[model samples]
Target: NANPLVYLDVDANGKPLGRVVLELKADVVPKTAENFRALCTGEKGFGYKGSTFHRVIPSFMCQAGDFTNHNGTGGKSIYGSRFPDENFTLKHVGPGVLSMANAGPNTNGSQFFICTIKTDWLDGKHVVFGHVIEGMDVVKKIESFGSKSGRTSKKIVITDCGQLS
Candidate 1:
């Protein structure tokens, strides 16, 4: 659970766009962390290659993790397994905060979001998994995909992922 943090490089059009180094709180959410670790270490688990951010809201958060390119409903584990909720005490404090995306209790698969600003209202409802340690500028560079209705025409891909020890 105390393993070295991992770096997630987000790309656009095959070029490096942004990077988010996540110090995974596996101890808090062992099952969730394990699920993400499997994908990060696997050849096909680099943040769902060819996926897109799909939904972004200025001053709120950026939602992504769609695997089938379907934006809203494409989220699924690389192995099609759902991880039990690892809800923690962390809050959606500010930028760089990472949390799980789910419809309800224990429904996590492969969806996540990054807060562009504080979202205290979402405090205990979502599972806090990790936090972005750097490259916030890059995160800002990513054009807003807007709400579910304003999908970005361009697809953002997480091209690479690895530990940053």
Candidate 2:
């Protein structure tokens, strides 16, 4: 019954994955926030639904939100192309840290990742816009998914997202 700024995974059992409430540095990382929040709007044909945790590094992070190509090879923004990285003095800290995924320094977009454990080295390299307020087990659950191809045999989805009211 918890909530989310962005939620992940749902199914018939209706089990709780500990909905995540995030503290997005909207003022600190406005461009990244605006771009992603727009994606969550599903406006102009892009959103987290129909997306997957396209890539996972065990005990580390699960990367996703590639609304265009599920393969992690593509994703654009409300800005319509790659945008500059939004760097700030923040730590990967611990599990459930939400961040923008990029190919290099300034290539941010709809693709994002959730860390399942402490990833201190990632600090400053990726924008640490939001850290999970709850549901880290959900992230660990997603990471613990058994696989060989890095893709899951079953589908994963963000059944809902928005502020808790």
Candidate 3:
């Protein structure tokens, strides 16, 4: 809907009570974008078909895209391994921004996060490859239901993440 980058959609099955449509910044993030696109489209791996938001931090962000374990402990790239973090100038200035969720410096792979509020301290640590173009309220809803430990009692499945046509 904005360019050549792949689009994303998430259906909460009425739990969060809305839809989420996001546009990835492939041209800007390149490799990380490629990793995400591959995970979404299932072109190389299992994709988001059985994935869920394994981690959620209220007022900060929600983490997901662990196509391997469906938990924060596992993730891999389309390259069949972790890729180096893509250098980007994007910032976590406000809510609704999408960035790769990593274990630590340069360990980025399939996990990603959606900000619920500004986290400036996260500035150059994570790769900001996508942003929530619509239905941020849904993300907020998910955030609202999260616990202090960043895990929700109920699961948040991805449903689907195919490109928009």
Candidate 4:
């Protein structure tokens, strides 16, 4: 089972709060999973490293992968600026559900979100590609910094990230 080990910190160079591991569902959404795995390893020299989880809503989701701008505005798919949503075979079952964040239909990019609770409304909308295999505690800590507007009060950055062997 391939997965990504992501380190999160409150400050730019602060001690890590913890590590979050995501398990990609290649069996379901192969393309999107591959994209996420590639971005985690950063072999393309562009990825989630140093990127901040810019949008986090309590009882909802924590969004990230905007390696370009570190905000919700920018991120590029390994395929290009954007790619089509692979499939909606997977559902946003509950917390830890990992899914792509897009502007609209078939506009998938590097940006993604991890559900903190059930998000049934997005079941058929976003590409549910993966889920948190470890460190949901760390994710909860990241969620604590979130406010009403989905903007985090402090920077919860991916200090380091890579594929787990």
Each candidate structure's TM-score, on Cα atoms with residue i matched to residue i, is 0.82, 0.82, 0.89, 0.92
Best by lDDT: 4
The CA lDDT at 129 in model 3 is 82
Of 3 and 4, which scores higher on TM-score? 4
Ranking by TM-score: 4, 3, 1, 2
Give the clashing residue pairs of candidate 4, or none.
none
Model 1 Cα lDDT, one tens digit per residue, 1-165: 384477778876667787877777776776676666655665563455556677777667777776665466757765564566666667787888888888877778888888888888778778887887787777776645454454654566777766565
Least well predicted 10-residue stretch by lDDT in candidate 2: 3-12
How much is 91 displaced in model 1, in angstroms?
A: 1.4
| lDDT scores of the candidates, listed in order | 0.70, 0.70, 0.76, 0.84
* Deviation of model 4 at 23, angstroms: 0.6
- lDDT per residue as tens, model 3, 1-165: 333344444445434355666777776776777777777788774677657887888988988888778778887887856777788588888998989888788888788899999988999899898788778878887787688897776777776677663
10 residues in a row with least lDDT, candidate 3: 1-10
* Ten-residue region with minimum lDDT total, candidate 4: 4-13
Query: Which regions of candidate 3 deviate over 4 angstroms?
Result: 1-16
Best by TM-score: 4
Best of the two (2, 4) by lDDT: 4
lDDT of 1: 0.70
- Rate residue 7 of model 3 by lDDT: 43
